[PDB]
Amino acid sequence: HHHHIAASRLDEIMERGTLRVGTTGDYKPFSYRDPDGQYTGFDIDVAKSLAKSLGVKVEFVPTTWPTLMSDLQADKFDIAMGGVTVTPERQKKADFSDPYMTFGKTPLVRKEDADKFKSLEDINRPDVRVAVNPGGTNEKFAREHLKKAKITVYENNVEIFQEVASGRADVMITDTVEALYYAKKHPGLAAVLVDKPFTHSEKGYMMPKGDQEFLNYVNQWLDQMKQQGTYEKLYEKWLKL
Ligand code: NA
């Protein structure tokens, strides 16, 4: 409320004049170090834009994966921003923003086929040569959701991405991170982000439990950020999408 009674974390931040952002600095492309050992990445950029929305300075507080949750609970920083995946273990002890990225499996295809394979429907066709490694989630995704396609099983150390590029297969199913990396590093390949059933996880900003005020601010701000195209530019800049 305004005819209000209480001070919130959102007030503490405004009164102190700094947003303390917990981040690991060991995770490209979200949070890492440039050639000088300053913070760089996707969520370093976002962090700065959140501080600026608030009218405050950003202060980056080093944390590590092993102490992320206890640092957050011990009020070392106001928010964790650093490609944090939303996991049940993490939600037990923290609140998450709405998701700013979804991920899981991502098809990797030739560059000129990018527009051609953009849905499950486009991919699950009998002329489509699908490539996977044996024995894990890539193979199981294909057997489950791509039954009309011609699925070939390779081996884990084979360069399957290169089978796609050279035209010996059409679509490689792999984790998002790998798709994105092979597409960025090969001029002939493109990664196409598709929603369910391909996506199975999400990334969010992690906040201490019980302050709906800051969390609501963040969520309104994320949505504003989506709406004006800022996440698109970030995807482009950092994910080379
Ligand atoms: Na590429």
Centroid of ligand 1 to alpha carbon of 172 (angstroms): 14
Rounded to a whole number of angstroms, the distance between the first and last alpha carbons of the chain is: 42
* Domains and their CATH numbers in the chain: 1-104+201-241 (3.40.190.10), 105-200 (3.40.190.10)
CA separation for the pair 134, 138 (Å, rounded):
8
Residue in 178, 168, 116, 120 with CA at minimum distance from that of residue 147? 120
Q: Give the Cα separation of 76 and 101 in Å (integer).
A: 25
Query: What is the whole-number distance in angstroms between the Cα of residue 11 and the centre of ligand 1?
Result: 45
Longest Cα–Cα distance in the chain: 68
DSSP state of 67: G
Q: Ligand 1: distance of its center to the CA of 135 in Å?
A: 27
Task: Give residue 137 CA to ligand 1 midpoint distance, Å.
Answer: 24
Type of residue at 81: M
CB-count exposure of residue 67 (10 Å: 0-12, 13-18, 19+): middle
Rounded to whole angstroms, the Cα distance separating 196 from 29 reads: 23
Cα 183 to averaged position of ligand 1 atoms, centre (Å): 4
CA of residue 186 to ligand 1 center, whole Å: 4
* Nearest-angstrom CA–CA distance, 38 and 25: 9
Distance, CA 239 to ligand 1 centroid (Å)?
11
Q: Which residues fall within 8 angstroms of residue 93, CB to CB, at 6 or more apart?
A: 69, 72, 73, 209
Distance separating alpha carbons of residues 161 and 110, to the nearest angstrom: 9
**Residue that has been written with the tokens 């964790």 in this structure:** 80
Distance 180 CA to ligand 1 centre (A): 9
CA 21–ligand 1 middle distance (angstroms) = 33
Going from the C-alpha of 41 to that of each of 3, 57, 224, the distances in angstroms are 40, 18, 20
d(CA 18, CA 79): 12
Distance 36 CA to ligand 1 centre (A): 28
Strand, helix or coil for residue 21: strand
How far, in Å, is the centroid of ligand 1 from the Cα of 35? 24
Crossing angle (nearest 10°) for helices 230-239 and 212-227: 80
CA–CA distance, 209 with 124 (Å, rounded to integer): 42
What letter represents residue 43's amino acid?
D
Tell me, in angstroms, the distance from the centre of ligand 1 to residue 84's CA.
Answer: 26
Q: Are strands 171-175 and 101-110 parallel, antiparallel or unpaired?
A: antiparallel
| Of 177, 200, 181, residue with least CA distance to 190 | 181
Burial class (CB in 10 A: 0-12, 13-18, 19+), 116: middle
C-alpha 101 – ligand 1 centre gap (Å): 20
